[PDB]
From Swiss-Prot:
Residues 16-122 form the Bromo domain. Phosphorylation by CK2 disrupt the intramolecular binding between the bromo domain 2 and the NPS region and promotes binding between the NPS and the BID regions, leading to activate the protein and promote binding to acetylated histones. In absence of phosphorylation, BRD4 does not localize to p53/TP53 target gene promoters, phosphorylation promoting recruitment to p53/TP53 target promoters. JQ1, a thieno-triazolo-1,4-diazepine derivative, and I-BET, a benzodiazepine derivative, have been tested on tumors with success. Treatment with GSK1210151A (I-BET151, a I-BET derivative) has strong effets on mixed lineage leukemia and promotes myeloid differentiation and leukemia stem-cell depletion. The chain holds residues 44 to 166 of 1362 of the full protein. Transmembrane segments: none annotated. Belongs to the BET family. Ubiquitously expressed. It is linked to Cornelia de Lange syndrome 6: A form of Cornelia de Lange syndrome, a clinically heterogeneous developmental disorder associated with malformations affecting multiple systems. It is characterized by facial dysmorphisms, abnormal hands and feet, growth delay, cognitive retardation, hirsutism, gastroesophageal dysfunction and cardiac, ophthalmologic and genitourinary anomalies. CDLS6 inheritance is autosomal dominant. A chromosomal aberration involving BRD4 is found in a rare, aggressive, and lethal carcinoma arising in midline organs of young people. Translocation t(15;19)(q14;p13) with NUTM1 which produces a BRD4-NUTM1 fusion protein. It comes from Homo sapiens. The record marks 98 as: Acetylated histone binding. Interacts with p53/TP53; the interaction is direct. Interacts (via CTD region) with CDK9 and CCNT1, acting as an associated component of P-TEFb complex. Interacts with RELA (when acetylated at 'Lys-310'). Interacts (via NET domain) with NSD3, CHD4, BICRA and ATAD5. The interaction with BICRA bridges BRD4 to the GBAF complex. Interacts (via NET domain) with JMJD6 (via JmjC and N-terminal domains); the interaction is stronger in presence of ssRNA and recruits JMJD6 on distal enhancers. Interacts with NSD3. Interacts with NIPBL. This is Bromodomain-containing protein 4. It is found in: Nucleus; Chromosome.
Amino acid sequence: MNPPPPETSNPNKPKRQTNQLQYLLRVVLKTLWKHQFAWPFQQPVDAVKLNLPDYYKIIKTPMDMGTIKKRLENNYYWNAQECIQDFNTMFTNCYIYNKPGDDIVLMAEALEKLFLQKINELPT
Ligand code: NA
């Protein structure tokens, strides 16, 4: 009843390593990954275990930090903006599905605040 997770590697997609991508993996993602609030974002939303039958009726573009982490480790991204887009998908899904002041939303907002600070420090 869960959808398959987003793809995290693709043999047909060109690959490269850049400073911005190495920074996204070794600084931005690590920082968020080890945050007190990271657990619910470390894997795709499991609508079965969470008992959310409408999650994937509302959320059609799922994203999560476990997928982002794999995509980085697998050199899935060609540029930093693809990865930043995935983070904003993850956050935006949370804010769309949930309500203001929900525990998961407040947790999302703290991680996004942190993400935004690290993304402001992106190497050129
Ligand atoms: Na909302």
